[PDB]
Design an enzyme around this catalytic site. Sequence first.
Site: not given
Ligand SMILES: CCCCCCCCNC(=S)N1[C@@H]2OC[C@H]1[C@@H](O)[C@H](O)[C@H]2O
Length: 438
Positions: A75, A119, A164, A288, A290, A344
């Site tokens: 992906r 994305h 997302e 997704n 986590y 994810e």
């Molecule tokens: C506050 C920090 C802002 C960015 C740090 C991470 C917070 C958001 N992270 C999110 S929502 N993530 C989802 O999976 C893993 C991480 C990112 O690596 C991926 O693109 C997303 O699809």
Amino acid sequence: VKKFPEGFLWGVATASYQIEGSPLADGAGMSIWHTFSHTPGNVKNGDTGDVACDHYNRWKEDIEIIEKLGVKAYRFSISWPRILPEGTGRVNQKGLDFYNRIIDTLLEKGITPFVTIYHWDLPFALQLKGGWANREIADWFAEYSRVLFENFGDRVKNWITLNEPWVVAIVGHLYGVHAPGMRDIYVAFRAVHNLLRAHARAVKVFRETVKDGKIGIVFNNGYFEPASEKIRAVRFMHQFNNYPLFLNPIYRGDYPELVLEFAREYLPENYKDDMSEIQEKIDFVGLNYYSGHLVKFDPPAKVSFVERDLPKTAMGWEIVPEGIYWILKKVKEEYNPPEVYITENGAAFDDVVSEDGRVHDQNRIDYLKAHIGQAWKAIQEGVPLKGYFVWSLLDNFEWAEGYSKRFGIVYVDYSTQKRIVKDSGYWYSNVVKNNGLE
Ligand SMILES: CCCCCCCCNC(=S)N1[C@@H]2OC[C@H]1[C@@H](O)[C@H](O)[C@H]2O
Ligand SMILES: [Ca+2]
């Protein structure tokens, strides 16, 4: 032993801005992540996606890693401003060339490409015109998507419109923590609505252009549990933060009840006029997942999180594997999509390279194993889960945290760009080869 169905798709996942680097190479336009990350104060340590994993140059090596691990699907997302540097109008052949080589290489190597159209790296040119706040993005997004379909639809058969869109809308336009870095609740809810309209227009165009593939859409989800008996705040967080914010419109033609209770005033006045178009048929749902969250009512959105003494990742995210089983059960029970993928799942840990040259991430192995076990369970109970994608192939630029958070099953030494397959990657290869656990 926990064996998955024949042909179950085991994959890994990445996103363009997080791994590629070279954001302005070969005629690419700036994205909003370029401009956001080059604004002081927005990203930890002043990190940017200028270099990242240098995947823009090292793509062949990275795919050879996927191949060597026997991983079956990849992906990846496409950078809109590499394709259309002004967002609409001119198409950049060098941008198409970059992804064409990746796609052909994957196919040559028997790996199934799953393409994420969006994305988060919106062309900056379109942000100047209001970005996701502007209704016209349904058209800009459809035109972008049409280009991808016309150029790649002969080979790529599995498509995702949006990654997302809750994060895009709320973290980008309400919290201001992500690009384009705004804090306005009315803008945030217009972005939610326009994300849905743009998603539906792209699927509509897809039916006209790629008569043989499938298209879906990916949502972030948490497992919200109530801090006591008394659970409505759990209901709100599910409907707001999870798939229902988008799936209620797609399948049922309106936003979920508790979202409208909170946010009606912030949506366009005549938003229902768009709902019949928003119901455009989709082929699969990507989830997704986590983290789990303990939630209790609290007189901001009338919800606050309650810390729990549970194992956590380097993100501070609580590890609650049953969460992935819950969200899979719940999506079947609420909307019964014909296919689901886990698009994810993964974890950030403080990975180190041992003196033995290896990365001994037993913590990440344990995390992936437990979650794959719960996914397996959902399948046994009739959830049509067709695939599972690890986030991520590579340590990469983790948005506002910059390079301080490592999610890869492959370690990246940023001083050299050396890749070191972690123990979790080796472990995962064996799962894929065996089509399941132990
Ligand atoms: C506050 C920090 C802002 C960015 C740090 C991470 C917070 C958001 N992270 C999110 S929502 N993530 C989802 O999976 C893993 C991480 C990112 O690596 C991926 O693109 C997303 O699809
Ligand atoms: Ca720079």
